[PDB]
Amino acid sequence: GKTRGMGAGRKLKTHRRNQRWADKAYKKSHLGNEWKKPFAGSSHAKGIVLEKIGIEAKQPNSAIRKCARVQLVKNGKKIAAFVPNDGCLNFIEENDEVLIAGFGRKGHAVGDIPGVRFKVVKVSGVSLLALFKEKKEKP
Amino acid sequence: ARGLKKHLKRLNAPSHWMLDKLGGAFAPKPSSGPHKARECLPLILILRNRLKYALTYREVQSILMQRHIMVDGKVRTDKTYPAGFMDIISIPKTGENYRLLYDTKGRFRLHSVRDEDAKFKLCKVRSVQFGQKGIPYLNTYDGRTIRYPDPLIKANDTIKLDLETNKIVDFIKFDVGNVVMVTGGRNTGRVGVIKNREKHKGTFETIHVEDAQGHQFATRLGNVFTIGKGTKPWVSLPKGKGIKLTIIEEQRKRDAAAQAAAK
Amino acid sequence: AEQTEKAFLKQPKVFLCSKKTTKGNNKPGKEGNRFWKSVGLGFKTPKEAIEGTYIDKKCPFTGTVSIRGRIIAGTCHSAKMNRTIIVRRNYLHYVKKYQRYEKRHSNIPAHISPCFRVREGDHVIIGQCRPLSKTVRFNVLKVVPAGSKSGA
RNA sequence: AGAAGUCCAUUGAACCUUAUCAUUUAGAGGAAGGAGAAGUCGUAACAAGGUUUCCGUAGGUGAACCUGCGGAAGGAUCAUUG
RNA sequence: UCCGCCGGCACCUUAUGAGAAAUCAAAGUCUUUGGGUUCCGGGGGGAGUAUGGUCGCAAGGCUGAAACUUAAAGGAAUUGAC
RNA sequence: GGCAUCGUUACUUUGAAGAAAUUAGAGUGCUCAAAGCAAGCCAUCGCUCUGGAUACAUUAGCAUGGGAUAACAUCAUAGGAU
RNA sequence: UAGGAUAGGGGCCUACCAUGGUGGUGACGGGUGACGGAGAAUUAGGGUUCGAUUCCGGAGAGGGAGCCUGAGAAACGGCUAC
RNA sequence: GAAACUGCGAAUGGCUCAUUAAAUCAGUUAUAGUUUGUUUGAUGGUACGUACUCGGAUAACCGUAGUAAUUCUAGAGCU
Ligand SMILES: [K+]
Ligand SMILES: [K+]
Ligand SMILES: [K+]
Ligand SMILES: [K+]
Ligand SMILES: [Mg+2]
Ligand SMILES: [Mg+2]
Ligand SMILES: [Mg+2]
Ligand SMILES: [Mg+2]
Ligand SMILES: [Mg+2]
Ligand SMILES: [Mg+2]
Ligand SMILES: [Mg+2]
Ligand SMILES: [Mg+2]
Ligand SMILES: [Mg+2]
Ligand SMILES: [Mg+2]
Ligand SMILES: [Mg+2]
Ligand SMILES: [Mg+2]
Ligand SMILES: [Mg+2]
Ligand SMILES: [Mg+2]
Ligand SMILES: [Mg+2]
Ligand SMILES: [Mg+2]
Ligand SMILES: [Mg+2]
Ligand SMILES: [Mg+2]
Ligand SMILES: [Mg+2]
Ligand SMILES: [Mg+2]
C-alpha cells in the first residue's frame, strides 16, 4: 500500500505532487486556462448589447428565455447574457451599455437555459432591480 | 541604499525604549558616539520619557542649549547623544548625578548616586596592544582610549576611571569569584558571581554565573561586566538585583494589596 | 624540482640568500627556512608540510591563507584536478508535513595542499577560508583514507 | 597652466539583415465531438433478445454490424465414480 | 492398509471476523486506524481521441491532453412485469 | 588551577543568541467595547524606585548532559594493547 | 601559475597550462496573472490558500548605456548620447 | 543686516513591484579580504639652506550689451 519508511519523505511528497492533478478543482485552478475565459478572471464585466434573442428552455420545460447577445469591451468576445425579472427585456435596447455578471455555478449553465452562464446586472449604468421595482428610470 | 540613513521608525526602535506605538511615525535615531546605538539611551529619552523635565522635541533643545546637561563630566548638547551604560548623567544646578544602570527586565534606570561617587565611573576593556612608536594603549568598550596602561591590565578587565583627572585609579581582573552584571540578552541587569568559564577554540566563550539568591544562569563572554572584587560591588545597585520570576512578582503585588492599603 | 613554471616560486618574506646560519632560528622562515604555521582549532601540521619542498601560497600550513569560519566534514567526490577536490556533504532534509527525512547532498569545492595525498571516497575535514577562486572557499585540513580506524 | 582638435584602447546605447524561441489570429477544403421537442433506414444489445455475450487481432459490407483464429464467463452448465 | 511431518493444487462446514452486498478462512487481525515495498484511481462523456516524443517494414505499441457537454453514469441485493 | 588525546551522526534534555509590530497573555473602570500603554493615591509646592510583565517563534547554526533505539566504516597475514 | 584592475578577496580581466564543473537527491530549460520575509484568512489536531501596500531587505525613476561631483550615487525633483 | 563668495546638505525621506526562482530574502557566519564625511577618546619636535602676518584674482556692486527666448550668454571698472 503506502510507503511508511522514515526515510521516504521525498517519495510521499513527490507522489502527492503528481496525484494532485487528478483533482478537478486543483487542475482547473493550476492549469491557467481560467485566463482564457471571456471574463479573464474577473467578477463582473461590461459590454455592448449586440442583439436581443430568445432561447427555448430545455426539456421537459417549455418557455422562451429572453437572453441578450452582447460583446465585452475588454477583449471583444461575444457572449449571451440572461435577462431576468419579466419585462426587463424592454429596458434593454440596441448597442446599449450593460454590466454582466456570472450566473452562479462558476462557469456552468444554470437552470434549463441551454449554454448560458452570464446574467445582466446593470443596463446604462442603472440596475435592473431598480428599474423593475420602478425605483429608477433609464436615462 | 546609496548611503547612510538618518531616520529611525518608531516600530524599529529598540525594545527598552518603551515608546507609545501611536505616538508618531519616527523615533529619535541615536547619534554616532561611545555606545552602540542599540544599547544606548539618547538624551531626548532622558529629559523626556524618563523625567518630566521636558514635554516635547522643543524643550529638550531649550534646556540643552542652556548647557544644563553634563554627561561623563562634560557638557553635551546633541539631544541624541548615546548615553549607553553607567554614564554619569550629572545634572548641575539641581544636582541629579545619575548612573545609567540596567534594570532586571533589561530596562534603563537612572540610579541617583551621591555627588562624590559621581566623580568616577567604570569601563570594560577591549583588546590591549601596541600603538605607534611602541606605546601601549587601552581602548575600552565605550570608545575611550588611554595611553600608557599598567601592564597588569589585560583584555575584558574593568577599570575604575576618574573624570576630572582622567586616569585609571584601580582595576578588577576577569576571573571567577567576582561580581558581574549582565548587560546583554535576556539576562540583562542580573548581578551574580562567576563560577566557571568555558572556552571553545574558535568562538563562543560562555560564562556561568551564580545569583545571590541561589539562581544560576549562563551567558556569553560579552554582555557581562565585572563590577567589584570578590562579592562586594563597587557601585550601588538600583533595587532587587534578582530576576524575580512572574509568580513572585504576583506575590509582591498581593502583599502590597494586603498591606499598606490593606482595606 | 618544485619549480615547474616560468617564474621562480618562493615563500614571501623569506629571504633565501642570507649568509648567516639557520636551523635553530625561531619562526621557521627566518634566515632561510621553510615557513609553516599551525592553523589552530586543534589541528596538527603534517610532517610533509614542515619537511617539504613544494610551494603553495594557498596551502593553509605553509601559505598566506588563514582558516576561520565554518569547519565541515565530508567525503571526497572527485579529485581530478590540480590541488583541488570536490567534497560531498550528505545530510537529511526534514519534510515537515510528512514528518519524514529525505536524503540530500551538496558538493563543495576545496583546495588540498600538496602535503595531503587523497583518493576518491576518502573522509576529509575542511575549513572555511577567504575565496581562492570562483568556487573554492574551503581548504582541506585533514584526510582519513577510506576503510581505516582499525586496531583493538 | 592650458581650450578646441586628433590617435589608440575600453564600456557600449541604437539601428540594419539572417536564423531561432514564445504568443494570438485569417484561411478554400477535410473531418471529429456535443446539443437540439423536426426526422429517414433498419433492429446490433438487454429474455437462450430469437445466430449466447464479450475481449485481442485481420478482412468485409449502407448503418447498427458480419465472419476467420486464439481467449474468457461477466453463461443459458458449479454435477456422470459412469 | 493405518498413523505422523514438510511442501503444493484445491474442496467442505461455520463465524466469534470482515464487507454495500454478492461473498471471502482470506477479500480477517481497521476510527481500538502505523510490518516492508512497487504500481495505480479521483463523477459520467469528449478519449486512450488531438499533438509532440519515441520503438516498428507496415498493421501498430509505450507516453498522452484540452475546449466543450452533462446530474446523474455505476455496484449489490429486493418486489413485480416480461 | 592542573594534564592529557578522543569514532562520526541522527534522536532527546538544558542553555544562549535571538527586531519591533501581529498572535497568546499579566496589570490597568478609555462611562462599556473594539482599543491605548496608560496611570493610581494623600487632596501634597508630592509620592508609589509607579508600570510600560511573560510565552511561542519550524528547519539550519552554537554549547551542556543522556546512550535506549537507529545509520557508516572500523572486526584474524597482528602492521594489536602494555 | 604570474600579472592587471579594484577599497579589497575572486576568471573580475590578460598570457600560458591542464580537462575539467553540474545532473533522476531533477542539473540544464520552460511557466508564473512570481519582489523575499515578518505576516493574513480559515483553523480539534495536522493542514490548505494568500502575502502590491505603512516594519526589514532588494530593485527602479519611460527603455537601455556612460559618467562628473562627493566620505557615500553608476543618483535621474544631476549631466551626456541613442 | 539684504545680495553675493565660502562651507554643508540634497545618496535620508517619499512612491512603486517591472525585472529577478539558490538569484533577491530569512536565520546563522567571516573580513587574518576591505572602504567609511561624521560623533567620542587619544596622539601631532626635523620646516630651516616678511613672520609684527606673503601674492594674484573674483562675486555681490556699477555700466556697455546680444538674443524671440530660459537661474541663455559676452565685454569694461572696484573690492
Ligand atoms: K579584487
Ligand atoms: K560631501
Ligand atoms: K552632497
Ligand atoms: K542571510
Ligand atoms: Mg572570531
Ligand atoms: Mg439457439
Ligand atoms: Mg437483436
Ligand atoms: Mg444475439
Ligand atoms: Mg473522471
Ligand atoms: Mg591575483
Ligand atoms: Mg584567457
Ligand atoms: Mg512580476
Ligand atoms: Mg511583500
Ligand atoms: Mg499605495
Ligand atoms: Mg520597503
Ligand atoms: Mg537607483
Ligand atoms: Mg510613467
Ligand atoms: Mg540613471
Ligand atoms: Mg519627479
Ligand atoms: Mg530620488
Ligand atoms: Mg551656495
Ligand atoms: Mg529611501
Ligand atoms: Mg525561469
Ligand atoms: Mg545560497
Vertex C65, ends C64 and C67: CA angle to 5°? 150
**Which residue's CA shows the smallest distance to C1' of F73?**
C147
DSSP single-letter state for residue B24: -
**Cβ contacts of residue B211 below 8 Å, gap of 6+?**
B190, B191, B192, B217, B242, B243
- The Cα B148–Cα B135 span in angstroms is 7
- The Cα A40–Cα A36 span in angstroms is 6
Question: Beta strand B8-9 with B41-42: parallel, antiparallel or unpaired?
Answer: unpaired
Contact residues, chain C, for B201 at CB < 8 Å? 40-42
3-state secondary structure C124-140: EEEEECCCCCCCCCEEE
C residues 57-96 near A, CB within 8 Å? 92-95
Contact residues, chain A, for C92 at CB < 8 Å? 7
Question: Within 7 Å: CB of B73 and strand F?
Answer: no
Whether chain C has a CB inside 8 Å of the CB on B202: the answer is yes
* C147 grid coordinates: 576503510
* B102 grid coordinates: 540596567
Cell 571516497 belongs to which residue?
Answer: C121
- In this structure, the number of other CB atoms found within 10 A of the CB of residue A33 comes to 10
Q: Which nucleotide is nearest to A36 (CA to C1')?
A: E67
| DSSP sequence for B159-226 | EEEESSS--EEEEE---TTSEEEE-SSTTTT-EEEEEEEE--TTS--EEEEEETTS-EEEEESTTEEE
Continuous segment of H or E residues that includes residue B236: none
Please give the C-alpha separations between residue C7 and each of B121, B141, C4, in angstroms, as whole numbers: 60, 48, 8
Spatial distance from the CA of A25 to the C1' of E36 (Å): 34
Mutate to test the interface with C, among A3, A4, A10, A20 (most CBs of C within 10 A): A10
CA of B58 to the centre of ligand 3 (A): 28
Chain A partners (3+ C-beta pairs within 8 A): C
- The Cα B146–Cα B134 span in angstroms is 14
- What is the torsional sign of CA B219, B223, B228, B229? positive
DSSP single-letter state for residue B11: G
Q: Cα B209 from chain centroid?
A: 19
- The Cα B162–Cα B72 span in angstroms is 10
DSSP single-letter state for residue C52: -
DSSP-assigned beta bridge partners for residue A118: A102
Question: Beta strand B168-172 with B179-182: parallel, antiparallel or unpaired?
Answer: unpaired
> Comparing C-alpha atoms, which of B147, B153, B151, B142 is closest to residue B166?
B147
Spatial distance from the CA of B127 to the C1' of G7 (Å): 25
Spatial distance from the CA of A73 to the C1' of F11 (Å): 64
Question: Within 7 Å: CB of A62 and strand D?
Answer: yes
Phi, psi of B118 (to 5 degrees): -90, 0
Cβ contact B–C (≥3 pairs, < 8 Å): yes
Cell 501611536 belongs to which residue?
Answer: B22
Contact residues, chain C, for B204 at CB < 8 Å? none
Are A7 and C94 inside 8 Å of each other by CB?
A: no
CA dihedral A41, A46, A51, A52 (to 10 degrees): 90
User: Is B29 marked within a binding site?
Assistant: yes
Continuous segment of H or E residues that includes residue B143: none
Question: H helices then E strands: how many in chain C?
Answer: 1, 7
Please give the C-alpha separations between residue C79 and each of B104, B138, C141, in angstroms, as whole numbers: 57, 50, 15
The minimal CB distance from A13 to the residues C92, C98, C103 is found for: C98
Chain B partners (3+ C-beta pairs within 8 A): C
Question: Beta strand C107-111 with C138-144: parallel, antiparallel or unpaired?
Answer: parallel
Sheet strands (E) in chain C = 71-78, 85-88, 91-95, 100-104, 107-111, 123-128, 138-144
Q: Which nucleotide is nearest to C128 (CA to C1')?
A: H30
> Comparing C-alpha atoms, which of B86, B89, B63 is closest to residue B234?
B86
Contact residues, chain C, for B202 at CB < 8 Å? 41, 71
Q: Are A80 and A118 in contact (CB under 8 A)?
A: yes
CB burial string B5-31: b at 16+ within 10 A, e below: eeebebeebbebbebeeeeeeebbebe
**Cβ contacts of residue A2 below 8 Å, gap of 6+?**
A12
Q: Cα A96 from chain centroid?
A: 20
* C93 grid coordinates: 532534509
> Comparing C-alpha atoms, which of C109, C106, C113, C107 is closest to residue C131?
C109
Examine residue B233 and say whether the peptide bond preceding it is cis (omega within 30 degrees of 0). no
Q: Are B142 and B123 in contact (CB under 8 A)?
A: yes
- What is the torsional sign of CA A48, A53, A58, A63? positive
- The Cα B163–Cα B88 span in angstroms is 10
Examine residue B82 and say whether the peptide bond preceding it is cis (omega within 30 degrees of 0). no
Question: Helix, strand or coil for residue B75?
Answer: strand
Helix, strand, coil abundance in chain C, percent, nearest 5: 5, 25, 70
Continuous segment of H or E residues that includes residue B247: helix B246-256
How many CA within 13 A on the CB side of residue B92?
13
Question: Beta strand C123-128 with C91-95: parallel, antiparallel or unpaired?
Answer: unpaired
| Amino acid making up residue B210 | E
Spatial distance from the CA of B225 to the C1' of E2 (Å): 100
- The Cα A137–Cα A131 span in angstroms is 6
Alpha-carbon gap: A55 to the closest alpha carbon of chain C (Å)? 52
- What is the torsional sign of CA B46, B52, B57, B62? negative
- In this structure, the number of other CB atoms found within 10 A of the CB of residue B232 comes to 9
